[PDB]
Amino acid sequence: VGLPYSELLSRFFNILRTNNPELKFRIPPPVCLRDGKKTIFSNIQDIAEKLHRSPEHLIQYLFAELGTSGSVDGKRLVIKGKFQSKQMENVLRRYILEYVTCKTCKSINTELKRENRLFFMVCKSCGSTRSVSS
Amino acid sequence: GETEEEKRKREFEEGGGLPEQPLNPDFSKLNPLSAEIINRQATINIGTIGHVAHGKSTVVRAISGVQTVRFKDELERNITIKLGYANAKIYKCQEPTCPEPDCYRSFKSDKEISPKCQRPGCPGRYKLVRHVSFVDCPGHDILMSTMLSGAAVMDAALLLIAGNESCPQPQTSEHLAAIEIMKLKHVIILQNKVDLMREESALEHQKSILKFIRGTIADGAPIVPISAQLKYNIDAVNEFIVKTIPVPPRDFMISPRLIVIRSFDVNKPGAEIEDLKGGVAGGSILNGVFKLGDEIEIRPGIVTKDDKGKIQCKPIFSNIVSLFAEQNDLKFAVPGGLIGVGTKVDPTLCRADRLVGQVVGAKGHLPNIYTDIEINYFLLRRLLGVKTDGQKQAKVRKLEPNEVLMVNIGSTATGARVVAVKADMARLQLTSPACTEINEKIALSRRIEKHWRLIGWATIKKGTTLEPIA
RNA sequence: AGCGCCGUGGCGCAGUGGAAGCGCGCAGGGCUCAUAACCCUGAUGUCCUCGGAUCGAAACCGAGCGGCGCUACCA
Ligand SMILES: Nc1nc2c(ncn2[C@@H]2O[C@H](COP(=O)(O)OP(=O)(O)CP(=O)(O)O)[C@@H](O)[C@H]2O)c(=O)[nH]1
Ligand SMILES: [Mg+2]
């Protein structure tokens, strides 16, 4: 008898429609600057906010993807190397795909935490515990 | 201005605390729901089964709140070989006024006797209907001995199916058939992913799941849609467990026994050795009431090979330091719940996977180790766990003489050789020791496609015994 | 959880017991009609934190932090 299954399914669907009416669409367009020998990315702070991501971890991940060196200037990242905006856009796309939003379900409110020395991710909307560090 | 820790204390002492168990209670009049038993140990073992990488630890964590944690750096992420344990307290609201679906509440093991209702508007308290243990069964296609043994432990089943993925998950069916092998009916079907489907997709998935459950032995399985991540619809799961699943027949008549699945050396590093503790066997008790201070013997134990290649078996005598169950040290042990029996054994026996699936008997009983075992087998039509791309799920062949196969005798994970094949009967020679106590429901797996594959069930009919050296 | 390693100048090694090092990088100059090659000058540091013997430690040690490899899951 699967009758008392559809009712609690209905209850769950009403829960979903109550909690999450909106059911990412919040990625700032990475408008970059390629000044020949130099490259300046101003959007680094905005993409830090709209993805709820702390700046230092994001910029170190960017430096870990591509072996290029520079500095951080001002609310912007100043890397002296050669990259089209498409490729840094692609790197940000990878980081968005595998860090800000989980592959299994649509969510974003998760953030960095340190659970016995690495960076162990946890969520807020759900309560996840996934060991994503590298 | 009370701190949250002060608030939680005040509620804990207000909830009756956790009273100490009586040292010597009259055991003839004790039932598994008794206040001394129900408050401080788990009387029913519920086991999680599901497809790989869908979430079975998370459902248990959402129910109780006790982390399986997951370990071994590399195993932190892929799969865990050992089982996952957690205790939940089942609390029902004493007020009839609150709706019946949400009155149930599953709390962690440290909750009080009667904690307050978190529903806004109900001053009623919670009564403890039962305490339950959870045995997280790994669901990988390579790891099969641990799943069979954890099954051999548990008494209630919990099936997880993901919605957006394909309906006929094969190793989920393998889990269900393994459950059917050991004589369990009480299975609750869970839909792990329901938020991520549409209304029509969820109904289609339910229709498919129902269409799968027509030929199997289990017929009236409850189906309930939950979410391990969103953490909702927990109370009705407790409802279904309480209503559908009663206590298996387990009283104090049967002689004492143990079945160890896990080994845990207790050697806190950095600490000086002059302050140490014994070796702990993580074992389940299906029969036997154990009290603080007892002499017990691990029957297969020391397994040696002489100069002549003969296997000598030395039982591990041991005195029980403590019977660690649930949260606190307990004066008596309840059958039907996994417990850490800490004994004087050297922790090097309980460091690695050494005491995984081994029989134990207190002093005052003589189980028999065997070397040849007569076994009565019966197989299914097809192998479970192979996604053939549309072509006739592989049919089980008839067994050959002299073939190494994994024969899970209760908890024991042994690789035996067939010395003779008959119409329904076989004889298995073992190099890894195995004992026989009563029947020890057995699972059979072959090596056809690299990793082990379940084929059918069996029960011992006879065997050639060995006399342990004293 | 303990033990093996470490604490940049942008890097890697280093002397680590007189107090700022070497090469690779980068800015600048030199040679050349000119470029590369070659030749010279450089500014970068809490040499991770806190205390201690020490004229004095960055160095010699310890009451804390962070990052690395094993012991391996160490109720
Ligand atoms: N979207 C979604 N994700 C879930 C749900 N339940 C669990 N997960 C995901 O599963 C992950 C945890 O998986 P885990 O419990 O380790 O899988 P497993 O139990 O080891 C698989 P096996 O039992 O075969 O070994 C989490 O990171 C979480 O995001 C759910 O209901 N919905
Ligand atoms: Mg598990």
How many angstroms separate the CA atoms of B105 and B93, rounded?
Answer: 8
- Tokens (6 digits) for B256: 């004492």
β-sheet bridge partners, residue B317: B297
All residues of chain A having their beta carbon less than 8 Å from the beta carbon of residue B206 are: 2, 5-6, 9
Return the CATH class of domain B251-366: mainly beta
Maximum pairwise Cα distance, chain A: 70
Both structure tokens of A47: 């993409």
In Å, how far from its chain's centre is CA B132? 11
Resolution in A: 4.0
d(CA B340, CA B362): 15
- B164-168 long-range CB contacts below 8 Å, 24 or more apart? B164/B193, B164/B196, B164/B197, B164/B201, B165/B51, B165/B54, B165/B193, B167/B205, B167/B208, B167/B209, B167/B212, B168/B208, B168/B212
Compute the distance between CA of residue B213 and CA of residue B193 in angstroms, rounded to an integer. 19
What's A99's DSSP letter? I
B-chain residue closest to A106, CA distance: B196
For the record, the structure tokens of B312 come out as: 């000598």
Report helix, strand or coil for B381. coil
Q: Which residue is nearest to nucleotide C11 (CA to C1')?
A: A69
Residue with tokens 């905006």: A85
> What are the residues facing B92 on neighbouring strands?
B127
Contact B206 A131 (CB under 8 A): no
End-to-end CA distance of chain B: 65
**Residue B347, SS3 per DSSP:** helix
Taking the C-alpha atoms of residue B32 and residue B23, their distance in angstroms, rounded to an integer, is: 17
CB atoms within 10 A of CB B418: 19
Q: At what angle do helices B170-181 and B145-153 cross, to 10 degrees?
A: 40
Searching chain A, which residue's CA lies closest to the CA of residue B197? A13
| Cα–Cα distances in angstroms (integers) from residue A14 to residues A11, A73, B98, B100, B162, in the given order | 5, 48, 20, 18, 20
Which structure tokens are listed for A123?
């969520």
Which residues in chain B are closer than 8 Å to A129, comparing Cβ atoms? 67
From residue B158, alpha-carbon distances to B155, B186, B276, B336, B384 in Å are 10, 9, 38, 17, 19
Integer-rounded Cα Rg, in Å, for chain B is 23
Superfamily of domain B41-250: P-loop containing nucleotide triphosphate hydrolases (3.40.50.300)
Distance in angstroms (rounded) separating the CA atoms of residues A114 and B453: 40
Residue A115, classified by CB atoms within 10 Å of its CB into exposed (0-12), middle (13-18) or buried (19+), is: exposed
Q: Is the dihedral of CA B218, B220, B225, B227 positive or negative?
A: negative
Dist. CA A126–CA B69, nearest whole Å = 17
The yes-or-no answer to whether B251-366 and B367-462 have a common fold is: yes
Method: cryo-EM
Ligand 1 atom nearest the C-alpha of A102 is 29
DSSP β-bridge partners for residue B447: B452
C-alpha B128/C-alpha B90 separation (Å) is 6
Q: Which residues pair with B341 in a beta bridge?
A: B281, B323
Q: Let me know: does B226 contact B192? Beta carbons within 8 Å.
A: yes
Contact B100, A8 (CB under 8 A): no
Q: Which of residues 62-121 of A touch B (CB under 8 A)?
A: 105-106
Q: B280 with B266: CB under 8 angstroms?
A: yes
Contact indicator for B337, B43 with CB cutoff of 8 Å? yes
Distance CA B421, CA B400 (A): 7
Distance of alpha carbon B387 from alpha carbon B64, whole angstroms: 34
Closest CA to B283 of B184, B149, B433, B413: B149
User: b/e for A5-29, b at 16 or more Cβ within 10 A?
Assistant: beebbebbbeebeeeeeeeeeebee
Which backbone phi and psi does B203 adopt, to 5 degrees?
A: -65, -40
| Å between B331 CA and nearest CA of chain A | 35
* Nearest to B224, CA basis, from B239, B213, B246: B239
User: How far is B4 from B11, CA to CA, in rounded Å?
Assistant: 10
> Cα separation of B407 and B416, whole Å?
6
Among A5, A106, A125, the residue with its CB nearest the CB of B206 is A5
Element (H, E) at B62: helix B57-63
SS3 content of chain A, % helix, strand, coil (to 5): 40, 15, 45
Residue with tokens 């002499």: B295
Residue whose CB lies within 8 A of the most ligand 1 atoms, among B49, B58, B82, for a mutation test:
B58
Reference B439, options B460, B414, B467, B423; nearest CA is B460
Number of H helices, E strands in chain A: 4, 6
Residue B210: its chain A contacts at CB < 8 A? 2
Would you kindly state where each structural domain of chain B is located, as residue ranges? 41-250, 251-366, 367-462
- Nearest-CA distance B319 → chain A (Å): 35
Mind spelling out the 3-state secondary structure of B135-159? EECCCCCCCCHHHHHHHHHCCEEEE
Phi/psi-derived region of residue A52, left when phi > 0, alpha when psi is between -120 and 50, beta in every other case = left
Which of B51, B70, B207, B232 should we substitute to test contact with A (largest number of A Cβ atoms within 10 Å)? B232
CB B106 within 8 A of CB B63: yes
- B148-B149-B151-B153 Cα dihedral, nearest 10 degrees: 170
Q: Which fold has domain B367-462?
A: Elongation Factor Tu (Ef-tu); domain 3 (2.40.30)
Q: What is each CA distance from B159 to A33, B162, B169, in whole angstroms?
A: 54, 10, 11
Find out whether A59 and A69 touch, Cβ atoms under 8 Å.
no
Cα separation of A119 and B48, whole Å?
28
How distant, in Å, are the alpha carbons of B63, B163, B230 from that of B234? Answer: 6, 18, 11
Composition of chain B by helix, strand, coil, percent to 5: 15, 35, 45
What is the phi-psi region of residue A127: left when phi exceeds 0, alpha when psi lies from -120 to 50, beta otherwise? left
Q: Which amino acid is at B406?
A: M
Q: What distance in angstroms lies between residue B378's CA and the mean position of ligand 2's atoms?
A: 30
Instruction: Report the distance separating Cα B189 and Cα B195, nearest Å.
Output: 17
- Residue B287 near residue B254 (C-beta atoms within 8 A): yes
Residues whose CB falls within 8 Å of the CB of residue A29, separated by 6 or more in sequence, listed in order: A43
Show which positions of strand C are touched by protein (CB under 7 A): 1-3, 10, 66-68, 71-75
- Find which of B230, B232, B243, B244 to mutate to test the A interface (most A CBs within 10 Å of its CB): B230
On the CB side of B15, CA atoms within 13 Å amount to 24
Residue numbers in B near A9 (CB within 8 A): 191, 194, 202-203, 206, 225
